[PDB]
Every structure is written in structure tokens, then in C-alpha cells.
Amino acid sequence: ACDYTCGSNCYSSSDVSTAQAAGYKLHEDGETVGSNSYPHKYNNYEGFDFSVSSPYYEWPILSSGDVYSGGSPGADRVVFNENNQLAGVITHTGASGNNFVECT
Ligand SMILES: Nc1nc2c(ncn2[C@@H]2O[C@H](CO)[C@@H](OP(=O)(O)O)[C@H]2O)c(=O)[nH]1
Ligand SMILES: [Ca+2]
């Protein structure tokens, strides 16, 4: 079973932790990867009711199992905060335009 289901993509908790660790490391060092500069601030315009405090940062999680290193980020993201606490896993899949919906 999937711990997180983003459209057709299936992720386990270990998939999420691995992605999160990479994005947080880059955040701590003040560095970014990709043309869209990840990780970067996630404003939560959608208004998700996260259990942890802001600010939030988004980082791509890939269905390939690889850690993001540039190029197309796909539709899925892991959102973490300043304390490296997982806020949630979100996706563009099943959402209008560039909006997000939570992965179930
Ligand atoms: N939909 C949405 N996009 C956000 C939010 N905060 C920041 N963004 C950025 O706006 C764009 C929406 O897809 C993305 O930028 P990017 O294209 O540079 O990756 C995304 O990172 C937010 O709360 N909601
Ligand atoms: Ca996996």
C-alpha cells in the first residue's frame, strides 16, 4: 500500500524522508538546483491545514525514486519547514492550472 498517493504515483514514507533530507540539506546550505530554484518558499495559497509551523519550503519528489537534481520536477512535491518537519506531500495532478491538491 502507498503511504502517499499522488495521482498515479505511489510513495512510501522512506521515499518521502529521502527526498525531504535532500531538500533540507540544500536549504541549510543556502543553495538551489534546477531552473525553478528548488527548494524554495511555499506560500500555501491553497490554504492547507498543516500541523506544523511555517515558513514552508517545497522540494520535488520523483516517481523514479531518484533525488531531484535538475530538469523537469514532475508534478509532486514534499513540503517541509524550518525545523525539517514534514508538512505534507502535494501534487499538481488533479488540480487546475498550477494549483496543488494533497496526496492521499
Ligand atoms: N500553487 C502554488 N504555487 C506556489 C505557492 N508558493 C509558491 N508557489 C510557486 O508558484 C509556482 C506554481 O506552480 C511554482 O513556482 P516555480 O514555477 O518557480 O516552481 C511554485 O513553487 C503556493 O502556495 N501555491
Ligand atoms: Ca518508492
PDB file of C-alpha atoms and ligand atoms in Angstrom:
ATOM      1  CA  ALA A   1       0.000   0.000   0.000  1.00  0.00           C
ATOM      2  CA  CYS A   2       1.083   3.591  -0.624  1.00  0.00           C
ATOM      3  CA  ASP A   3       1.744   5.875   2.322  1.00  0.00           C
ATOM      4  CA  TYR A   4       1.090   8.759  -0.074  1.00  0.00           C
ATOM      5  CA  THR A   5      -0.736   8.569  -3.411  1.00  0.00           C
ATOM      6  CA  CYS A   6      -0.248  11.491  -5.816  1.00  0.00           C
ATOM      7  CA  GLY A   7      -2.459  10.735  -8.799  1.00  0.00           C
ATOM      8  CA  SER A   8      -0.941   7.502 -10.115  1.00  0.00           C
ATOM      9  CA  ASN A   9       2.349   7.909  -8.220  1.00  0.00           C
ATOM     10  CA  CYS A  10       2.882   5.731  -5.156  1.00  0.00           C
ATOM     11  CA  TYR A  11       5.241   6.834  -2.376  1.00  0.00           C
ATOM     12  CA  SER A  12       6.359   5.212   0.851  1.00  0.00           C
ATOM     13  CA  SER A  13       7.463   7.050   3.996  1.00  0.00           C
ATOM     14  CA  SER A  14      11.072   6.192   3.147  1.00  0.00           C
ATOM     15  CA  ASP A  15      10.662   7.791  -0.305  1.00  0.00           C
ATOM     16  CA  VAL A  16       9.438  10.980   1.380  1.00  0.00           C
ATOM     17  CA  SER A  17      12.145  11.042   4.079  1.00  0.00           C
ATOM     18  CA  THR A  18      14.879  10.596   1.470  1.00  0.00           C
ATOM     19  CA  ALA A  19      13.545  13.447  -0.692  1.00  0.00           C
ATOM     20  CA  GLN A  20      12.993  15.688   2.345  1.00  0.00           C
ATOM     21  CA  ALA A  21      16.535  15.137   3.659  1.00  0.00           C
ATOM     22  CA  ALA A  22      17.994  16.257   0.318  1.00  0.00           C
ATOM     23  CA  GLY A  23      15.846  19.376   0.075  1.00  0.00           C
ATOM     24  CA  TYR A  24      16.510  20.359   3.680  1.00  0.00           C
ATOM     25  CA  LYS A  25      20.269  19.944   3.247  1.00  0.00           C
ATOM     26  CA  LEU A  26      20.192  22.323   0.284  1.00  0.00           C
ATOM     27  CA  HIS A  27      18.049  24.758   2.277  1.00  0.00           C
ATOM     28  CA  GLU A  28      20.555  24.751   5.162  1.00  0.00           C
ATOM     29  CA  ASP A  29      23.466  25.421   2.820  1.00  0.00           C
ATOM     30  CA  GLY A  30      21.611  28.194   1.016  1.00  0.00           C
ATOM     31  CA  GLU A  31      21.911  26.502  -2.379  1.00  0.00           C
ATOM     32  CA  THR A  32      19.382  25.597  -5.080  1.00  0.00           C
ATOM     33  CA  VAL A  33      19.048  23.210  -8.036  1.00  0.00           C
ATOM     34  CA  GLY A  34      17.041  23.423 -11.245  1.00  0.00           C
ATOM     35  CA  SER A  35      15.849  26.372 -13.319  1.00  0.00           C
ATOM     36  CA  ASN A  36      12.989  26.960 -10.882  1.00  0.00           C
ATOM     37  CA  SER A  37      15.401  27.080  -7.958  1.00  0.00           C
ATOM     38  CA  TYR A  38      14.398  24.314  -5.542  1.00  0.00           C
ATOM     39  CA  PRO A  39      13.934  24.231  -2.685  1.00  0.00           C
ATOM     40  CA  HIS A  40      12.029  27.480  -2.368  1.00  0.00           C
ATOM     41  CA  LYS A  41       9.318  29.075  -0.281  1.00  0.00           C
ATOM     42  CA  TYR A  42       5.845  27.540  -0.464  1.00  0.00           C
ATOM     43  CA  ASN A  43       3.276  30.231   0.346  1.00  0.00           C
ATOM     44  CA  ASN A  44       0.348  27.861   0.961  1.00  0.00           C
ATOM     45  CA  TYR A  45      -2.039  29.948  -1.175  1.00  0.00           C
ATOM     46  CA  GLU A  46      -4.177  26.786  -1.256  1.00  0.00           C
ATOM     47  CA  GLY A  47      -4.679  27.115   2.489  1.00  0.00           C
ATOM     48  CA  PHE A  48      -3.861  23.544   3.519  1.00  0.00           C
ATOM     49  CA  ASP A  49      -4.231  22.955   7.246  1.00  0.00           C
ATOM     50  CA  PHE A  50      -0.706  21.777   8.073  1.00  0.00           C
ATOM     51  CA  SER A  51       0.058  20.576  11.607  1.00  0.00           C
ATOM     52  CA  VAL A  52       3.493  22.237  11.709  1.00  0.00           C
ATOM     53  CA  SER A  53       4.561  25.907  11.701  1.00  0.00           C
ATOM     54  CA  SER A  54       5.583  27.989   8.695  1.00  0.00           C
ATOM     55  CA  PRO A  55       7.679  29.015   6.794  1.00  0.00           C
ATOM     56  CA  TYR A  56       7.260  26.141   4.342  1.00  0.00           C
ATOM     57  CA  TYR A  57       9.567  25.020   1.531  1.00  0.00           C
ATOM     58  CA  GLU A  58       8.736  22.857  -1.461  1.00  0.00           C
ATOM     59  CA  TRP A  59      11.028  20.234  -2.955  1.00  0.00           C
ATOM     60  CA  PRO A  60      10.244  17.801  -5.813  1.00  0.00           C
ATOM     61  CA  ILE A  61       9.746  14.116  -5.081  1.00  0.00           C
ATOM     62  CA  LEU A  62      10.230  11.899  -8.143  1.00  0.00           C
ATOM     63  CA  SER A  63       8.295   8.750  -9.070  1.00  0.00           C
ATOM     64  CA  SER A  64      11.571   7.356 -10.421  1.00  0.00           C
ATOM     65  CA  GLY A  65      12.869   7.018  -6.878  1.00  0.00           C
ATOM     66  CA  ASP A  66      15.767   9.354  -7.699  1.00  0.00           C
ATOM     67  CA  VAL A  67      16.512  12.521  -5.732  1.00  0.00           C
ATOM     68  CA  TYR A  68      15.812  15.697  -7.726  1.00  0.00           C
ATOM     69  CA  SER A  69      18.909  17.216  -9.328  1.00  0.00           C
ATOM     70  CA  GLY A  70      17.559  19.429 -12.099  1.00  0.00           C
ATOM     71  CA  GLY A  71      15.331  19.323 -15.145  1.00  0.00           C
ATOM     72  CA  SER A  72      11.614  18.597 -15.005  1.00  0.00           C
ATOM     73  CA  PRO A  73      10.451  18.366 -11.349  1.00  0.00           C
ATOM     74  CA  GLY A  74       7.306  16.448 -12.261  1.00  0.00           C
ATOM     75  CA  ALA A  75       4.001  17.147 -10.531  1.00  0.00           C
ATOM     76  CA  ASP A  76       4.787  16.043  -6.965  1.00  0.00           C
ATOM     77  CA  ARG A  77       6.358  17.908  -4.028  1.00  0.00           C
ATOM     78  CA  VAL A  78       7.288  17.362  -0.390  1.00  0.00           C
ATOM     79  CA  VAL A  79       6.694  20.408   1.836  1.00  0.00           C
ATOM     80  CA  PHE A  80       8.887  20.781   4.938  1.00  0.00           C
ATOM     81  CA  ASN A  81       9.523  23.604   7.413  1.00  0.00           C
ATOM     82  CA  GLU A  82      12.446  25.371   9.109  1.00  0.00           C
ATOM     83  CA  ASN A  83      12.768  22.545  11.653  1.00  0.00           C
ATOM     84  CA  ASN A  84      12.839  19.835   8.975  1.00  0.00           C
ATOM     85  CA  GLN A  85       9.321  18.749   9.937  1.00  0.00           C
ATOM     86  CA  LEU A  86       7.208  17.223   7.168  1.00  0.00           C
ATOM     87  CA  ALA A  87       4.188  19.435   6.474  1.00  0.00           C
ATOM     88  CA  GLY A  88       2.799  17.183   3.755  1.00  0.00           C
ATOM     89  CA  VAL A  89       3.019  15.788   0.233  1.00  0.00           C
ATOM     90  CA  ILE A  90       1.212  17.687  -2.520  1.00  0.00           C
ATOM     91  CA  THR A  91       0.687  17.435  -6.264  1.00  0.00           C
ATOM     92  CA  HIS A  92      -0.332  19.392  -9.368  1.00  0.00           C
ATOM     93  CA  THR A  93      -2.100  16.216 -10.551  1.00  0.00           C
ATOM     94  CA  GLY A  94      -5.874  16.614 -10.420  1.00  0.00           C
ATOM     95  CA  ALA A  95      -5.617  20.351  -9.724  1.00  0.00           C
ATOM     96  CA  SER A  96      -6.388  23.252 -12.083  1.00  0.00           C
ATOM     97  CA  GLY A  97      -3.531  25.145 -13.706  1.00  0.00           C
ATOM     98  CA  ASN A  98      -0.606  25.418 -11.301  1.00  0.00           C
ATOM     99  CA  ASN A  99      -2.612  24.834  -8.132  1.00  0.00           C
ATOM    100  CA  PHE A 100      -1.949  21.932  -5.763  1.00  0.00           C
ATOM    101  CA  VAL A 101      -4.058  19.301  -4.001  1.00  0.00           C
ATOM    102  CA  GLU A 102      -2.866  16.999  -1.229  1.00  0.00           C
ATOM    103  CA  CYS A 103      -1.709  13.490  -1.980  1.00  0.00           C
ATOM    104  CA  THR A 104      -3.954  10.969  -0.231  1.00  0.00           C
TER     105      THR A 104
HETATM  106  N1  LIG B   1       0.166  26.925  -6.344  1.00  0.00           N
HETATM  107  C1  LIG B   1       1.103  27.462  -5.558  1.00  0.00           C
HETATM  108  N2  LIG B   1       2.294  27.798  -6.075  1.00  0.00           N
HETATM  109  C2  LIG B   1       3.147  28.330  -5.165  1.00  0.00           C
HETATM  110  C3  LIG B   1       2.915  28.542  -3.830  1.00  0.00           C
HETATM  111  N3  LIG B   1       4.028  29.102  -3.217  1.00  0.00           N
HETATM  112  C4  LIG B   1       4.888  29.212  -4.192  1.00  0.00           C
HETATM  113  N4  LIG B   1       4.433  28.766  -5.414  1.00  0.00           N
HETATM  114  C5  LIG B   1       5.170  28.773  -6.714  1.00  0.00           C
HETATM  115  O1  LIG B   1       4.375  29.244  -7.831  1.00  0.00           O
HETATM  116  C6  LIG B   1       4.517  28.315  -8.947  1.00  0.00           C
HETATM  117  C7  LIG B   1       3.217  27.465  -9.072  1.00  0.00           C
HETATM  118  O2  LIG B   1       3.336  26.253  -9.849  1.00  0.00           O
HETATM  119  C8  LIG B   1       5.724  27.440  -8.594  1.00  0.00           C
HETATM  120  O3  LIG B   1       6.977  28.118  -8.864  1.00  0.00           O
HETATM  121  P1  LIG B   1       8.097  27.532  -9.889  1.00  0.00           P
HETATM  122  O4  LIG B   1       7.370  27.513 -11.192  1.00  0.00           O
HETATM  123  O5  LIG B   1       9.177  28.539  -9.783  1.00  0.00           O
HETATM  124  O6  LIG B   1       8.458  26.200  -9.342  1.00  0.00           O
HETATM  125  C9  LIG B   1       5.515  27.356  -7.097  1.00  0.00           C
HETATM  126  O7  LIG B   1       6.718  26.951  -6.488  1.00  0.00           O
HETATM  127  C10 LIG B   1       1.648  28.185  -3.282  1.00  0.00           C
HETATM  128  O8  LIG B   1       1.304  28.324  -2.117  1.00  0.00           O
HETATM  129  N5  LIG B   1       0.787  27.644  -4.227  1.00  0.00           N
HETATM  130 CA    CA B   2       9.448   4.167  -3.914  1.00  0.00          CA
END
